[PDB]
Write an enzyme that holds these catalytic residues in place. Structure first.
Site, PDB file in Angstrom:
ATOM      1  N   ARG A  91       0.854  -1.192   0.000  1.00 41.59           N
ATOM      2  CA  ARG A  91       0.000   0.000   0.000  1.00 41.59           C
ATOM      3  C   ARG A  91       0.886   1.237   0.000  1.00 41.59           C
ATOM      4  NH1 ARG A  91      -4.703  -0.693  -1.788  1.00 41.59           N
ATOM      5  NH2 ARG A  91      -5.624   1.012  -0.549  1.00 41.59           N
ATOM      6  N   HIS A 109      12.911  -3.465  -0.672  1.00 36.79           N
ATOM      7  CA  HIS A 109      12.564  -3.462  -2.102  1.00 36.79           C
ATOM      8  C   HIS A 109      13.489  -4.419  -2.878  1.00 36.79           C
ATOM      9  CE1 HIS A 109      10.587  -1.722  -5.618  1.00 36.79           C
ATOM     10  NE2 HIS A 109      11.765  -1.733  -6.217  1.00 36.79           N
ATOM     11  N   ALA A 141      10.334   8.149   2.628  1.00 38.99           N
ATOM     12  CA  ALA A 141      10.146   9.602   2.569  1.00 38.99           C
ATOM     13  C   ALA A 141       8.853   9.985   1.843  1.00 38.99           C
ATOM     14  CB  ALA A 141      11.342  10.255   1.883  1.00 38.99           C
ATOM     15  N   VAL A 144       8.356   8.476  -3.051  1.00 38.07           N
ATOM     16  CA  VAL A 144       8.992   7.194  -3.339  1.00 38.07           C
ATOM     17  C   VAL A 144      10.180   7.289  -4.293  1.00 38.07           C
ATOM     18  CG1 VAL A 144       6.904   5.872  -2.891  1.00 38.07           C
ATOM     19  CG2 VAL A 144       7.332   6.775  -5.177  1.00 38.07           C
ATOM     20  N   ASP A 145      10.962   8.355  -4.164  1.00 41.95           N
ATOM     21  CA  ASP A 145      12.128   8.557  -5.014  1.00 41.95           C
ATOM     22  C   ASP A 145      13.294   9.217  -4.283  1.00 41.95           C
ATOM     23  OD1 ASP A 145       9.898   8.128  -7.025  1.00 41.95           O
ATOM     24  OD2 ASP A 145      11.559   8.465  -8.416  1.00 41.95           O
ATOM     25  N   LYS A 171      15.485 -13.405  -2.700  1.00 47.21           N
ATOM     26  CA  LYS A 171      14.861 -13.529  -1.374  1.00 47.21           C
ATOM     27  C   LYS A 171      15.876 -13.932  -0.278  1.00 47.21           C
ATOM     28  CE  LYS A 171      10.621 -12.707  -0.058  1.00 47.21           C
ATOM     29  NZ  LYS A 171       9.978 -11.435  -0.499  1.00 47.21           N
TER      30      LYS A 171
END
Length: 201
Positions: A91, A109, A141, A144-145, A171
């Protein structure tokens, strides 16, 4: 000892690696609550079997982002939480919620940022044709960059790899750097300077 909350949406393999590491004798953090935005997922069983309480907060039952995020924050205050870890939470958080937890929330990520932002990173890497990919742990932040990077690990791509085989290899690296990053931040070794840049003691 710092009190932690972990938010999830699915299986919970990263959650398990975090539980096991904070159990070790020398750990600086303790996990007190686990929250999921989806009912009946495997991650909830893992948390209960470790003696950690759970709560399900479904985004489909609210009118918008702000109301959903407020429901989550109420629970974090109830357990006097200090740090939040996003482990497979699918989300996008509202501006104010991100402001309140600035410098106290970490995300994982599956790529070497700034490459392949957004969903389905492995599929992007295979379409493009790189021979090297990896994973990243960073502070979250208001955009998202620009979230400050804490740790990264490079992973090789094999010719003949499928989305399933590359996902499996990346993973294993995730299970290594996420627990290491939580300990760096929980012990005060790594902090977000007031100049908006990462800082090491």
């Amino acid at each position: 000892r710092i009190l932690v909350a972990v938010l999830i949406s699915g299986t919970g393999s990263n959650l398990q690696a975090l539980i096991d590491s904070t159990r070790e004798p020398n750990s600086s953090a303790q996990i007190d609550i686990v929250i999921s935005n989806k009912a009946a997922v495997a991650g909830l069983d893992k948390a209960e079997r470790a003696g950690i309480p759970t709560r399900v907060i479904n985004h489909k039952l609210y009118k918008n982002r702000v109301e959903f995020d407020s429901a989550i924050d109420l629970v974090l205050e109830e357990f006097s939480i200090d740090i939040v870890c996003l482990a497979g939470f699918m989300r996008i958080l509202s501006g104010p919620f991100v402001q309140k937890w600035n410098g106290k929330m970490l995300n994982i990520h599956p790529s070497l940022l700034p490459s392949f932002k957004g969903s389905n990173a492995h599929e992007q890497a295979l379409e493009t044709g790189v021979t090297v990919t990896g994973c990243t742990v960073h502070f979250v932040a208001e955009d998202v960059d620009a979230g400050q990077i804490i740790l990264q690990e490079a992973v090789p791509v094999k010719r003949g790899d499928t989305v399933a085989t590359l996902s499996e290899r990346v993973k294993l690296a995730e299970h290594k750097i996420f627990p290491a990053a939580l300990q760096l931040v929980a012990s005060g070794t790594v902090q977000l300077g007031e100049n908006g840049k990462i800082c090491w003691v």
